[PDB]
Design a protein around this motif. Structure first.
Motif, PDB file in Angstrom:
ATOM      1  N   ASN A  42      12.296   8.392  -4.321  1.00 52.55           N
ATOM      2  CA  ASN A  42      12.236   7.875  -5.680  1.00 52.55           C
ATOM      3  C   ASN A  42      13.394   8.402  -6.508  1.00 52.55           C
ATOM      4  OD1 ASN A  42      11.669   7.155  -8.302  1.00 52.55           O
ATOM      5  ND2 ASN A  42       9.565   7.933  -8.309  1.00 52.55           N
ATOM      6  N   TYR A  60      11.091   0.379  -5.240  1.00 54.57           N
ATOM      7  CA  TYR A  60      10.092   0.500  -6.292  1.00 54.57           C
ATOM      8  C   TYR A  60      10.709   0.164  -7.643  1.00 54.57           C
ATOM      9  CZ  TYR A  60      12.639   4.680  -7.350  1.00 54.57           C
ATOM     10  OH  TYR A  60      13.634   5.568  -7.679  1.00 54.57           O
ATOM     11  N   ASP A  93       8.336  10.510  -0.471  1.00 53.89           N
ATOM     12  CA  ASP A  93       8.459   9.443  -1.453  1.00 53.89           C
ATOM     13  C   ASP A  93       9.056   9.957  -2.754  1.00 53.89           C
ATOM     14  OD1 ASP A  93       8.171   7.343  -3.253  1.00 53.89           O
ATOM     15  OD2 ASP A  93       6.191   6.762  -2.520  1.00 53.89           O
ATOM     16  N   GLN A  94       8.832  11.230  -3.089  1.00 52.95           N
ATOM     17  CA  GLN A  94       9.393  11.770  -4.323  1.00 52.95           C
ATOM     18  C   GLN A  94      10.915  11.835  -4.251  1.00 52.95           C
ATOM     19  OE1 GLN A  94       7.677  15.657  -4.786  1.00 52.95           O
ATOM     20  NE2 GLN A  94       8.669  16.502  -2.958  1.00 52.95           N
ATOM     21  N   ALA A 119      11.620  -7.456   1.346  1.00 53.95           N
ATOM     22  CA  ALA A 119      10.346  -7.251   2.025  1.00 53.95           C
ATOM     23  C   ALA A 119       9.991  -5.773   2.007  1.00 53.95           C
ATOM     24  CB  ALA A 119      10.402  -7.758   3.468  1.00 53.95           C
ATOM     25  N   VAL A 120       8.727  -5.477   1.726  1.00 53.02           N
ATOM     26  CA  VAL A 120       8.235  -4.102   1.679  1.00 53.02           C
ATOM     27  C   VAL A 120       8.296  -3.514   3.084  1.00 53.02           C
ATOM     28  CG1 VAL A 120       6.763  -4.656  -0.277  1.00 53.02           C
ATOM     29  CG2 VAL A 120       5.822  -4.731   2.046  1.00 53.02           C
ATOM     30  N   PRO A 122      11.848  -5.861  -3.500  1.00 55.02           N
ATOM     31  CA  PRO A 122      10.570  -5.721  -2.781  1.00 55.02           C
ATOM     32  C   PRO A 122      10.500  -4.454  -1.955  1.00 55.02           C
ATOM     33  CG  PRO A 122      11.392  -7.961  -2.624  1.00 55.02           C
ATOM     34  CD  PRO A 122      12.505  -7.142  -3.205  1.00 55.02           C
ATOM     35  N   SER A 123      11.571  -4.118  -1.237  1.00 61.21           N
ATOM     36  CA  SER A 123      11.578  -2.862  -0.501  1.00 61.21           C
ATOM     37  C   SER A 123      11.521  -1.685  -1.464  1.00 61.21           C
ATOM     38  CB  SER A 123      12.823  -2.780   0.382  1.00 61.21           C
ATOM     39  OG  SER A 123      13.975  -3.202  -0.325  1.00 61.21           O
ATOM     40  N   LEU A 161      17.024  -5.657  -2.859  1.00 66.04           N
ATOM     41  CA  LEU A 161      16.189  -4.507  -2.516  1.00 66.04           C
ATOM     42  C   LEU A 161      14.923  -4.341  -3.360  1.00 66.04           C
ATOM     43  CD1 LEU A 161      17.197  -2.762  -0.128  1.00 66.04           C
ATOM     44  CD2 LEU A 161      19.056  -3.945  -1.311  1.00 66.04           C
ATOM     45  N   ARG A 174       1.698   5.256  -2.579  1.00 69.50           N
ATOM     46  CA  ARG A 174       1.438   6.613  -2.118  1.00 69.50           C
ATOM     47  C   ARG A 174      -0.038   6.798  -1.799  1.00 69.50           C
ATOM     48  NH1 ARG A 174       4.444  11.262  -2.929  1.00 69.50           N
ATOM     49  NH2 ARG A 174       5.699  10.274  -4.573  1.00 69.50           N
ATOM     50  N   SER A 202       4.766   2.618  -6.977  1.00 65.68           N
ATOM     51  CA  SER A 202       5.001   3.796  -6.147  1.00 65.68           C
ATOM     52  C   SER A 202       3.742   4.643  -6.012  1.00 65.68           C
ATOM     53  CB  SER A 202       6.146   4.624  -6.729  1.00 65.68           C
ATOM     54  OG  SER A 202       7.341   3.868  -6.794  1.00 65.68           O
TER      55      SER A 202
END
Ligand SMILES: [Mg+2]
Lengths: 133, 118, 113, 86, 77, 195, 101, 132
Positions: E19, E49, E15-16, B29-30, E46-47, E44, B49, B45
């Motif tokens: 990632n 990227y 987020d970078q 789940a996100v 869906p959670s 993982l 963002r 991504s």
């Protein structure tokens, strides 16, 4: 596979003073849907069972309030339209329940309320005599 | 003679910390910040963002509108008064060198300080 | 204190991150104080400035400038009664009432009959 | 009886109300200052939230250009047509 | 990687950086059977990227688990 | 142009932590829910509308969260937090002996931003005069003073307090009133001796 | 932007009666009291008579909020009968059904 | 003949939804209420305020998400928490959707001094109950 290692628990402190003793907690749920009330009752009774406390159940009668409005706009006195709100009561008594147990249980239940319901607490606690008497 | 359990004191957030530690993270789940439906579901991504940045931009727009028209939200309808919800006041008062100097550290800028030094 | 809170807000900004659960959302709402603190006492705040039942009810301390027989005494006793019966208004409002009454009949001290 | 009269006097001194006898025109003061007036009731204080705030907010937000007010669009187009036709 | 894996998950933040971390993590896990790796992944996804999927494809190749690649391509699509 | 990915129905397995996937109260979200549960009056040789457009499941209150497993989990978690009731207090006669003075308050809770409501102030309390007065003159005096606050069938003296808006104001005012009442029933007067 | 000028007047009257509520209460008690001097009763009556217009809480009217209809309005909901029937039929508000009893 | 929250029977060229199709006297028997609050029940108050504010909220959100919705909303007020639920179409971009979501959330929160949150469910084309 992602299972946490150590579950962080909140801090708890036992204050030196004694906890209050609730004699009886009588909760009353006013709702519109008997099915929602029954689901909420099953939820509460199962929670109280798993916590290990007493419980009794009974279904007070249904109360209704109705009122008549003019069906049309300008000139119609005999032609009316009626409406009514039905409130359904469900009462639950808990006996011999410690103060901290009361706090935790009421917090849980109040967070896990449904929407179209109103909740009325009557708390009954005993106490000894004062010092001036 | 009589036994009595001792009283305890909790934080308002401690109970919910317990409730949260009771449950593990959602699987497959996100994040909760993102919606649940599949169309709005951010599926990359860069787009995610941009999405939460658009949300933050809406937050800034809300800040702008509230601090541009405070009188609209001035009503304290909620029983508990909350300065986090009250409108925000970066308005210099009338000419008063002492109170203006005290307000310097409140306004958080430099033009007021230049004028006060002047 | 100034640079202290500057570093504190810097550390805060470094810490803060997006939450992933409604329990965390509720933790946030509670820690900023928008979410109600259960149990609901209906009195979280608005404590009436620590006022007291006797300050509300017993107005004999505020009744000083008249004897205990006259019609002014009768009226002010009835006023104190009604005020003590009233829970909606507090000691401040009651003293404002009795002060306005003092002003009134001291400005209309012409009669004293 | 005088005994019951003094019993009532004591009960009044205890529970707050007047010990001395009193007429209904005098207990008027008592209950008036007990219950606040309709003018002070919140229902008369706020019969409804202000159309001032509501309409000003919605007008400013339309000028911002976010709330597509259909009724306002309608009124504007008909005003335009009226001023065009005289 | 398992060692590097209470509320210490706030230090990821941008987020970078998240990632970069997840990318290198899954890359090491792929280039390490891979049944547990694909289990963690399918948990993982869906959670969580292109490079990661390339490493996944070459890991599945060296594993010879042909039947899994379709589902991965479908998820990416 | 853009197309929405298919729901989580085929994704979710039979073995799944529902208390984890639905931690708190939330709407139906059919895209995440795999159940085909439908609800709606069907047309003649028709059927209820599918879950995707069935906004009536959203209309109705929601209980997919808080499953029995979730309830068991949370109760097992909070078991260490909740405390125990004294075993000595296991009967009404015993508890009223240990603590005769009964006292009870109350208040509602309703959906909305505001929380205050004047009924929060009212409180009541009770005490039986069978064991507390310890005398006869003061007992007769007290029962003569009180008009309807007693009940001899059940033999309990009950009194309410609502004069103050605050619950603790009501509480301590009732306590002080009871104290002064006992202290004034202790003594007597000459007109009281003459009856 | 109230609905109309009569709503404007009604709200003006409401605010006037509010901001002169406690004053009118005090002086009306001083008037209606019985044991106090009749000359004082007359003083307070002349005071009330000299008080400004639109200050009494009887000139106001429990008018509707949506359509500004004075008649056919419930004190509880404050809404006119027509708009109430409209909302109840469209299902806007909660917990009202037709009385098919 | 009664005309109250009902559709005129046409030739068969009128797509109608569940709610727009069913009658108001079917509301408790075969529908739910668009709002869920306790002001209507006995002992509570501020029901007029609840209704006024929820009507204003419905109008404001309909006009700040115009052309995307295809049905009435679902309001769910649990104590202090306010939850909205909407069904919309995939007309515009998710960028715009989330931007307006955050915008409306912030406005409602700052206006009502209340914790507000909303959900939206996507549909390719509006569901129809029948063709009347
Ligand atoms: Mg008819």
């Amino acid at each position: 596979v992602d299972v946490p290692k150590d579950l962080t628990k909140p801090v708890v402190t036992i204050s030196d003073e004694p906890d209050i003793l609730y004699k009886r907690l009588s909760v009353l749920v006013k709702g519109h849907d008997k099915a929602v009330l029954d689901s909420y009752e099953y939820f509460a009774v199962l929670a109280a069972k798993e916590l290990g406390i007493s419980i009794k159940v009974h279904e007070p009668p249904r109360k209704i309030e109705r009122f008549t409005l003019l069906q049309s706009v300008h000139i119609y006195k005999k032609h009316r339209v009626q409406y009514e709100m039905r409130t359904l009561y469900r009462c639950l008594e808990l006996e011999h329940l410690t103060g901290s147990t009361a706090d935790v249980y009421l917090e849980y239940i109040q967070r896990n309320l449904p929407e179209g319901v109103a909740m009325e607490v009557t708390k009954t606690q005993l106490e000894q005599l004062p010092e001036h008497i | 003679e009589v036994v009595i359990p001792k009283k305890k004191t909790w934080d308002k957030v401690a109970v919910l910390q317990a409730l949260a530690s009771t449950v593990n993270r959602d699987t497959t789940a996100v994040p909760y910040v993102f919606q649940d439906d599949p169309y709005l579901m951010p599926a990359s991504s860069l787009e995610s963002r941009s999405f939460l940045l658009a949300k933050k931009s809406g937050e800034n727009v809300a800040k702008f509108i509230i601090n541009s028209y405070p009188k609209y939200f001035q009503k304290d309808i909620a029983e508990p008064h909350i300065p986090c919800l009250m409108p925000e006041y970066f308005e210099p008062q009338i000419k008063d060198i002492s109170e203006a100097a005290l307000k310097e550290r409140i306004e958080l800028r430099k033009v007021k300080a230049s004028v006060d030094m002047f | 204190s100034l640079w202290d809170v500057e570093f504190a807000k810097q550390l805060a900004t470094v810490n803060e991150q997006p939450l992933q659960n409604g329990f965390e959302e509720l933790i946030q709402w509670t820690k900023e104080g928008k979410l109600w603190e259960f149990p609901i006492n209906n009195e979280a705040g608005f404590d009436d400035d620590g006022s007291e039942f006797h300050e509300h009810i017993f107005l004999e301390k505020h009744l000083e400038s008249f004897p205990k027989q006259g019609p002014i005494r009768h009226f002010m006793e009835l006023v104190t009664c009604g005020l003590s019966k009233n829970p909606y208004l507090s000691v401040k409002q009651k003293v404002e009432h009795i002060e306005w009454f003092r002003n009134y009949f001291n400005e209309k001290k012409d009669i004293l009959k | 009886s005088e005994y019951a009269f003094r019993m009532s006097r004591l009960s009044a001194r205890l529970f707050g109300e007047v010990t001395r006898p009193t007429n209904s025109k005098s207990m008027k003061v008592v209950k008036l200052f007990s219950e606040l007036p309709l003018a002070k009731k919140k229902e008369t204080y706020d019969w409804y939230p202000n159309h001032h705030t509501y309409a000003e907010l919605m007008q400013t937000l339309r000028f911002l250009g976010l709330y597509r007010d259909e009724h306002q669009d309608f009124m504007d187009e008909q005003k335009r047509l009226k001023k065009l036709r005289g | 990687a398992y060692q590097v894996h209470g509320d210490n998950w706030k230090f990821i933040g941008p987020d970078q950086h998240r990632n970069f971390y997840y990318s290198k993590f899954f890359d090491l896990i792929c280039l390490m059977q891979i049944d547990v790796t694909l289990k963690w992944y399918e948990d993982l996804i869906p959670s969580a990227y292109s490079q990661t999927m390339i490493h996944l494809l070459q890991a599945l190749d060296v594993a010879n688990r042909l039947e899994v690649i379709p589902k991965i391509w479908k998820d990416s699509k | 142009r853009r197309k929405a990915l298919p729901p989580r129905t085929e994704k979710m397995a039979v073995d799944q932590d529902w208390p984890s996937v639905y931690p708190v109260a939330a709407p139906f979200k059919p895209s995440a829910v795999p159940l085909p549960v439908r609800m709606g009056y069907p047309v003649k040789k028709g059927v209820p509308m599918a879950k995707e457009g069935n906004l009536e499941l959203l209309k109705i209150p929601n209980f997919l969260h808080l499953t029995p497993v979730a309830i068991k989990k949370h109760c097992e978690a909070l078991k260490d937090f909740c405390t125990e009731w004294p075993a000595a207090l296991d009967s009404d006669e015993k508890c009223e002996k240990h603590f005769p003075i009964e006292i009870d308050s109350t208040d509602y809770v309703s959906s909305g931003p505001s929380v205050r409501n004047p009924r929060a102030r009212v409180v009541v309390l009770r005490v039986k005069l069978s064991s507390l007065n310890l005398d006869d003159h003061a007992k007769k005096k007290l029962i003569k003073l009180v008009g309807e606050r007693y009940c001899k069938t059940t033999d309990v003296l009950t009194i309410k307090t609502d004069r103050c808006p605050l619950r603790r104001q009501n509480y301590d005012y009732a306590v002080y009133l009871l104290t002064v009442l006992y202290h004034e029933s202790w003594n007597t007067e000459e007109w009281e001796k003459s009856k | 932007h109230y609905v109309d000028w009569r709503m404007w007047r009604d709200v003006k009257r409401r605010k006037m009666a509010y901001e002169y509520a406690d004053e009118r209460l005090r002086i009306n008690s001083l008037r209606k009291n019985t044991i106090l001097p009749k000359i004082l009763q007359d003083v307070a009556d002349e005071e009330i008579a000299a008080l400004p217009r639109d200050s009494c809480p009887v000139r106001i009217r429990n008018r509707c909020v949506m359509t500004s209809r004075p008649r056919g309005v419930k004190r509880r909901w404050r809404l006119s009968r027509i708009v109430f029937r409209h909302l109840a039929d469209h299902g806007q508000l909660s917990g009202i059904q037709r009385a098919t009893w | 003949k009664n005309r109250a929250a009902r559709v005129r029977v046409s030739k068969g060229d009128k797509p109608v939804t569940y709610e727009e199709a069913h009658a108001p006297h079917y509301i408790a028997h075969r529908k739910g209420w668009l709002s869920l609050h306790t002001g209507n029940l006995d002992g509570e108050d501020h029901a007029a305020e609840r209704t006024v504010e929820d009507v204003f909220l419905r109008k404001f959100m309909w006009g700040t998400f115009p052309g995307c919705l295809a049905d009435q909303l679902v309001l769910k007020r649990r104590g202090n928490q306010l939850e909205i639920c909407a069904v919309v179409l995939r007309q515009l971009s998710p960028h715009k959707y989330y931007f307006l979501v955050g915008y409306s959330e912030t406005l409602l929160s700052y206006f009502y001094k209340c914790p507000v949150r909303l959900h939206l469910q996507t549909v390719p084309s509006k569901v129809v109950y029948k063709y009347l």
